[PDB]
Ligand binder design. Sequence first.
Ligand SMILES: *C(=O)[C@H](CCCC)NC(=O)O[C@H](Cc1ccccc1)C(C)C
Length: 213
Amino acid sequence: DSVDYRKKGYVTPVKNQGQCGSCWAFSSVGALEGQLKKKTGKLLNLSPQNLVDCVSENDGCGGGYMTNAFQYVQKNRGIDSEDAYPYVGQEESCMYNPTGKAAKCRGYREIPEGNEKALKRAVARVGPVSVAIDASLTSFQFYSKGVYYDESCNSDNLNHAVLAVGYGIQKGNKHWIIKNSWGENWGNKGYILMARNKNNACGIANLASFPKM
Ligand SMILES: *C(=O)[C@H](CCCC)NC(=O)O[C@H](Cc1ccccc1)C(C)C
């Protein structure tokens, strides 16, 4: 059992945060995009800028939480599209666009903390799932290929949000198919395969969630 939403057209191209710590915004957007495709058949970029500028509970370019983002989209009656609310790599005034909403959100669900099997079930039944991991390691920052696994990764040190678009096995190594938001020059075309069922490496399942659409 393995799934690759990229193969089903549930994933938009890899984005680049620019000089802004908006990992969580891209992560949330990637998740909503997946549900939008599943629900309507259309694959299009949602606005991470809309979240950066508007999610009051977060710190824009200084960090944030996907859950808060999903809550905002629901309470806000929607999120605009990238075309209607362009990414600028820096936090600005929350702008309202009457004809900008491209997607909706009915709330969200969290994956039971540390449960990698629950994470697998969610990814399979829902679609791409937002997750938080410890990305402070040089090995991760400079990851190139294969299945990433470092014994120094700290599951108690979540500092980066990415998107789980699937999971599988490579050369007998189970893994999570992760979409990053540091451009296509990072990792393998912007993607990284992270160890799966390897004792919850990097805390991949400590802060996972997806939106209800
Ligand atoms: C991902 O780009 C951001 C970068 C912030 C560091 C400049 N990391 C992040 O949002 O982590 C959040 C928790 C957090 C960390 C620091 C400040 C505020 C919030 C979770 C997604 C781990």
